[PDB]
Amino acid sequence: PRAPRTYSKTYSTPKRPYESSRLDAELKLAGEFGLKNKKEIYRISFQLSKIRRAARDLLTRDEKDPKRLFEGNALIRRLVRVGVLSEDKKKLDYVLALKVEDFLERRLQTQVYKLGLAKSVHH
Amino acid sequence: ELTVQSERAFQKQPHIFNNPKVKTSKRTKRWYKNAGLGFKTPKTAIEGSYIDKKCPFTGLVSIRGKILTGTVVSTKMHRTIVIRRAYLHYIPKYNRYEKRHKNVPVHVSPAFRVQVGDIVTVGQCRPISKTVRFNVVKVSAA
């Protein structure tokens, strides 16, 4: 009779699973960023869809809106904190212009490569 | 109606005693109460002779809670009439309303005069009968 724990699925399978154009796109991304499962690409796209949906819902509200402002800066502050959005792009419109590569670059795997301690993403 | 005493028992206001050895004003004592909510007691309930222990102004019933309104569709019972209340239920699916009606049986007092096709307001009181749970407080007709 204890309160049940909450679980959620963090990835979204593509509606079209069988397409050469998308298939090669994720293979290029996975190989460049060193990813084994394409569910990792499915996961990171799922997070992008959620924040885009939340940001889109904010953009249908007028300016000087307490709900739009508070959640708008909070989402913007989180994005600039994690490093996916530059300081001069904090205007709530570039948030909709974020891509998967920008989020993938912030992963610790790529940062280890960038600082020069692995010599290869697989390493 | 025609006769105040038309039953086997003697109809009287409970615990109201008229002393047979005095000649005080307004002969038989007629206890009356004010329902409230701006509902004035009709003069018939003040100078009348009916008892109607369930009357909202001369009986013992206390009126509290909802104060509904509706027209009169039937008057074939004794001291009790049926009212019809019309509302508009909203269906969330096809973005509009529909007409619906409910027949609420209410208790009426001999002081009031209600006919078929009369908008009346009824107040909630204690259960008077199996289906009757409202009392007429004010008839609205010219």
Binding site: - | R8, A9, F10, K130
Partner: protein
């Protein structure tokens, strides 16, 4: 036992209500008392939340009060002569609320003789002063005094015997006495 719910009865639309619950205890109902007269036998029935109720059977004597005079004297009962609801109660002489009993009324006559100093039909300054002071009020209606010459007045039990274990009431006087007298007299 006897149920007291509204789930075993037809609805206002004539529909037959289906069974929902077994007969609950907070809707229980016990049997009628049917109180007789003489040889007092009062039983007790345990009710909800304690509060014992005295079930009355065969009550011999009760309390009756003269509203006009304002007194209340113990008086023996001797049967009922009129009952509005049913007539078999009159035949069986069962004591229930709102029943026209025919009381002994002997103490009431004794009180009147000892209070206002007058006799119904049929030497001390302290007593005489009250008797003279209480004048102009020793005259009552003809019906009550006529029944006093009969040594019996009519009354009406105003206390529920089964629920309270006591049957109390008042002596009829006024329009009620005239009303009930006509029904008894009516041919």
């Amino acid at each position: 036992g006897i149920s007291r719910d509204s789930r075993h009865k037809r609805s206002a639309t004539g529909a037959k209500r289906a069974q929902f619950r077994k007969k609950r205890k907070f809707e229980l109902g016990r049997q009628p008392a049917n109180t007789k007269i003489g040889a007092k036998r009062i039983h007790s029935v345990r009710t909800r939340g304690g509060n014992k109720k005295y079930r009355a059977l065969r009550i011999e004597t009760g309390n009756f009060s003269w509203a006009s005079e304002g007194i209340s004297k113990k008086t023996r009962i001797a049967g009922v002569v009129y009952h509005p609801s049913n007539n078999e109660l009159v035949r069986t002489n069962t004591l229930t609320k709102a029943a026209i009993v025919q009381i002994d009324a002997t103490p009431f006559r004794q009180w009147f003789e000892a209070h206002y100093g007058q006799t119904l039909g049929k030497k001390s300054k302290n007593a005489e002063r009250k008797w003279a002071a209480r004048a102009a009020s020793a005259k009552i209606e003809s019906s009550v005094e006529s029944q006093f010459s009969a040594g019996r007045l009519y009354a009406c039990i105003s206390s529920r015997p089964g629920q309270s274990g006591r049957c109390d009431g008042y002596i009829l006087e006024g329009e009620e006495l005239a009303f009930y007298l006509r029904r008894l007299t009516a041919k």
